[PDB]
């Protein structure tokens, strides 16, 4: 009924924090995002997760980091958390130099490809635009 | 067990929509996710925690913009769960 969270370690929590983007992307700088990665750092620290902040990665650096974390052994760990703080579009996260599909980042942690994580919760937290609609709200 | 099982995607915003961020305090969703994890990670199951985040962003935030088309705008995060069990942090 509930996942075994009694493993030797809570697990890995990766924070990818992107604030400044190449001129080629046209993406504005993300003021306020240092606060986000520092609020997430202390929050997941106190939850007994191993927090690694990475700053301003290109999109090949994003795919590299993810394949390397997928290749570590998490067998003494309960869960895996990945926090993506970027610009994005629907199905897409931006490196500093351009876009990459979200599914390419998460297919690295699939059960048949990250076996020390099979049967365990993999949690992707994604602060990123997914398009360009705006919500005008309602009266209540 | 399917290869897609046991994946939980907590998106900051609904599909198709911008995500909003405050220049001093951070993104509306990350501000809310930590504040709810702080107060609730020892009590509630993860889905119920994320549901409090959803309520927090939907209720407490509205955009302030010098731009007519960007002013008075709202947001709701989007929980996508392929989890097969309940998730507790204790």
């Amino acid at each position: 009924n509930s996942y075994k969270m009694d493993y030797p370690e809570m697990g890995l929590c990766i924070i990818i924090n992107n604030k400044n983007f190449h001129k080629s992307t046209g993406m504005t700088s993300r003021s306020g995002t240092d606060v986000d990665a520092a609020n997430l750092r202390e929050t997941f620290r106190n939850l007994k997760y191993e927090v690694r902040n990475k700053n301003d990665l290109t999109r090949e650096e994003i795919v590299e980091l993810m394949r390397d974390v997928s290749k570590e052994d998490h067998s003494k760990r309960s869960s895996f958390v990945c926090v993506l703080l970027s610009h994005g579009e629907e199905g897409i996260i931006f490196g500093t130099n351009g876009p990459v599909d979200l599914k390419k980042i998460t297919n690295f942690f699939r059960g048949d490809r990250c076996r020390s994580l099979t049967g365990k919760p993999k949690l992707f937290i994604i602060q990123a635009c997914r398009g360009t609609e705006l919500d005008c709200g309602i009266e209540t | 067990i399917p290869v897609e099982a046991d994946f939980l995607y907590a998106y900051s915003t609904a599909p198709g929509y911008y995500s909003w961020r405050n220049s001093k305090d951070g993104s509306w969703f990350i501000q809310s996710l930590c504040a709810m994890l702080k107060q609730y990670a020892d009590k509630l199951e993860f889905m119920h925690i994320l549901t409090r985040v959803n309520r927090k962003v939907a209720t407490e935030f509205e955009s302030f913009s010098f731009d007519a088309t960007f002013h008075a705008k709202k947001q709701i995060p989007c929980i996508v769960s392929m989890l097969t069990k309940e998730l507790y942090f204790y």
Partner: peptide, 7 residues
């Protein structure tokens, strides 16, 4: 208050 491109 910022957004995370312009359509």
């Amino acid at each position: 208050d910022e957004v995370x491109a312009a359509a």
